[PDB]
Design a protein around this ligand. Structure first.
Ligand SMILES: Nc1nc2c(ncn2[C@@H]2O[C@H](COP(=O)(O)OP(=O)(O)O)[C@@H](O)[C@H]2O)c(=O)[nH]1
Ligand SMILES: [Mg+2]
Ligand SMILES: [Zn+2]
Lengths: 201, 26
């Protein structure tokens, strides 16, 4: 069985727990690690080359009080760094998370995710999201509450870890139904805005 | 040989008596 420890980090309140819990089996088969106060969600995705399991480490809120302990990071093979596109300070703190992460983990593939893009009054827009470009990371807009772009970070990570740029997910995992609607037009605009931003500067 | 932690799922060495991550016993 192919599996990877994936650490999910970012400021308190950015939507990490809401994001990981979208995956229904990941939630039903989650494991609590009492010593570190972590829940590990085993998220299986079915690819054209078979199942890949991401064991996603979600905190119990301790990130609100400072950096996470070494044991949280140890043996991570990949990571998602999340911020909230409605809270500029959460984006300002991304470089801190990246530092703390790479201090313990070095090499690993990392996706940067701007969460909550379902919220109309967006504060951190495409033109301001630069950190990934500075550090060779992949970026996605997401909305945990609507499942918007849910699979994207996992698929990018899988391709990187497996070393197969043509890897595909055969089907989406079973997800909790969207609690909010992600306006298709809005999504189209944000995707374009990221394209424009990517070709810019 | 190596052993997967049944508490946190991290892969550990044969030498390891406890998990390098979560300190759980083999
Ligand atoms: N509108 C919206 N709210 C969200 C989204 N994701 C999380 N939230 C809200 O943000 C708050 C914190 O979410 P939580 O998962 O606890 O964030 P965490 O502390 O990083 O784990 C909660 O009230 C969530 O309902 C999202 O995609 N859209
Ligand atoms: Mg949380
Ligand atoms: Zn362990």
């Amino acid at each position: 069985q192919v599996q990877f420890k994936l650490v999910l980090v970012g400021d308190g309140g950015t939507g990490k727990t809401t994001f990981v819990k979208r995956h229904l089996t990941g939630e039903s088969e989650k494991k609590y690690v009492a010593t570190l106060g972590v829940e590990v969600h085993p998220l299986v995705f079915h690819t054209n080359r078979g199942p890949i399991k991401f064991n996603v480490w979600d905190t119990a809120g301790q990130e609100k009080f400072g950096g996470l302990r070494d044991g949280y990071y140890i043996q991570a093979q990949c990571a998602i760094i999340m911020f909230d596109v409605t809270s500029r300070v959460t984006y300002k703190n991304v470089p801190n998370w990246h530092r703390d992460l790479v201090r313990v983990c070095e090499n690993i593939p990392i996706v940067l995710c701007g969460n909550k893009v379902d919220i109309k009054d967006r504060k951190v827009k495409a033109k301001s999201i630069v950190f990934h470009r500075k550090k060779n990371l992949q970026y996605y807009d997401i909305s945990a509450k609507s499942n918007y772009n849910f699979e994207k970070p996992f698929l990018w990570l899988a391709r990187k870890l497996i070393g197969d740029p043509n890897l595909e997910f055969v089907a989406m995992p079973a997800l909790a139904p969207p609690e909010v609607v992600m306006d298709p037009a809005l999504a189209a605009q944000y995707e374009h805005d990221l394209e424009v931003a990517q070709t810019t500067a | 040989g190596s052993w997967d932690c049944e508490v946190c799922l991290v892969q550990n060495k044969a030498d390891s008596t406890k998990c390098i991550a979560c300190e759980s016993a083999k």
